């Protein structure tokens, strides 16, 4: 297998703008949304068909109750953060928990929090400590660190339970997450500004999104400014990317263990 990941996000907004829910919590297996919950629906629903098919009502039933409580803790934890910072108006609270099951069988785990879209607390599962960015984060840190049971549980979840779910979902969504759709690469040459010749290496219709693209001169890497295009969703479950140079040259693409070379 390639590198796969599980993640759950939480967003808490104080004093929202009529339409914006007070709380939203979304799960992903890689680039794919898998679960959704919000303060409006007050329910955990699937965001992938293979999630709906492989999880019984008892799973959605339980986690729905769990999320209502999580929603409540977020409201209180955000209010208290604002009280420390002496902040009025609308402010955001965020959380990200997750794990990666690496190509080589090795695993990683993350749990971090943010206030106003900026790093607030960052959990260290190796030292069982919280990394505080300021003195407000430091007060929450001292408090959180007092409950050794919760820290140990958080380590066990990230290290064991998380990877276990990720492995379940990978199987559930095997046909989607594990497939490989090779890229359609092309090179475009154009006399732009008088003299300047711009070469475009454009790739499309590939899955997974992770692609590597570079330009090389005579065989060696370009000691010139390569402009890179973002890996964007095509909207059909496939992705598109590019890389340009200002000019022999050859475009190099690696995607899903296959190397590609396009000379000019």
């Amino acid at each position, epitope marked *: 297998m390639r590198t796969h990941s599980l993640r759950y996000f939480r967003l808490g907004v104080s004093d929202p703008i009529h339409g914006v829910p007070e709380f939203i919590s979304v799960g992903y297996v890689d680039s794919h949304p898998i679960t959704t919950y919000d303060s409006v629906t007050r329910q955990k629903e699937p965001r992938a068909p293979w999630m709906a098919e492989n999880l019984a009502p008892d799973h959605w039933e339980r986690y729905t*109750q769990l999320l209502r*409580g999580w929603q409540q803790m977020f409201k209180v934890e955000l209010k208290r953060l604002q009280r420390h910072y002496n902040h009025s108006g609308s402010h955001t609270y965020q959380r990200m928990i997750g794990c990666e099951l690496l190509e080589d069988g090795s695993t990683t785990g993350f749990l971090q929090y943010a206030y106003d879209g900026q790093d607030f607390l960052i959990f260290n599962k190796d030292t069982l400590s919280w990394l505080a960015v300021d003195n407000v984060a430091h007060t929450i840190k001292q408090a959180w660190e007092a409950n050794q049971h919760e820290l140990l549980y958080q380590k*066990n979840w990230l290290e064991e339970e998380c990877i276990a779910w990720l492995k379940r979902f990978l199987e559930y969504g095997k046909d989607t997450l594990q497939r490989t759709e090779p890229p359609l690469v092309r090179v475009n040459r154009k006399e732009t500004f008088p003299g300047v010749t711009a070469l475009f290496c454009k790739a499309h219709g590939f899955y997974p999104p992770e692609i590597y693209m570079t330009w090389m001169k005579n065989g060696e890497e370009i000691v010139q400014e390569i402009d890179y295009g973002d890996i964007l969703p095509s909207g059909d479950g496939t992705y598109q990317a590019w890389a340009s140079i200002e000019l022999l040259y050859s475009c190099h693409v690696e995607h899903s263990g296959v190397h590609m070379v396009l000379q000019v």
Partner: antibody
Amino acid sequence: QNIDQPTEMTATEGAIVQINCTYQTSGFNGLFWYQQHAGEAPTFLSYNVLDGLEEKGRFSSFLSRSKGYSYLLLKELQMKDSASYLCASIDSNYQLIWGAGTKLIIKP
Amino acid sequence: GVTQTPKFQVLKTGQSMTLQCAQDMNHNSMYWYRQDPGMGLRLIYYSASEGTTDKGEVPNGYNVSRLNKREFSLRLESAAPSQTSVYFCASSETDPNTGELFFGEGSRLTVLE
């Protein structure tokens, strides 16, 4: 799924007793031990999620996540230790699954 | 901590019944259990936080109401002799609980024809 511990155990006062608890569950988020005197409310003894032994006076709790088992060790047994000992495990859906309890009988 | 009333109750088959539970500790989660001889505690109903409740393992014959953050009352609508058990009201800081689960004194309820 199933949490199993002995129905009853008997040991002599002043000796040591080890109460075993095996969890056959779909996932694991921590194991608990509760004390319950005849006709009284249960009380928290310990919570174990990571591997190892934890001493709280005459009472110790051990967990082996690989072996899917934990024990309660009572050293220097007293007549006051005559109670039931309930173990309970948390599955991947965060639900507590309680064992039937171990009635500890101490012989004076 | 957790105050639960009554300690004992005698009911006739079909009588309504309400068991009270209240907590001082500012806990968000509250639980209703029954303890029957030969088996592990069975969750009847639970409240993960104020403003929500859900079915436990044994919800038939019962209903709950999380009145506020402190009270979680159980209700037996039509008592049945199967409902003869020891009811334990419990509370914890949050759900899921990795901390101490606090139990009420217990309620011995006996249902007869």
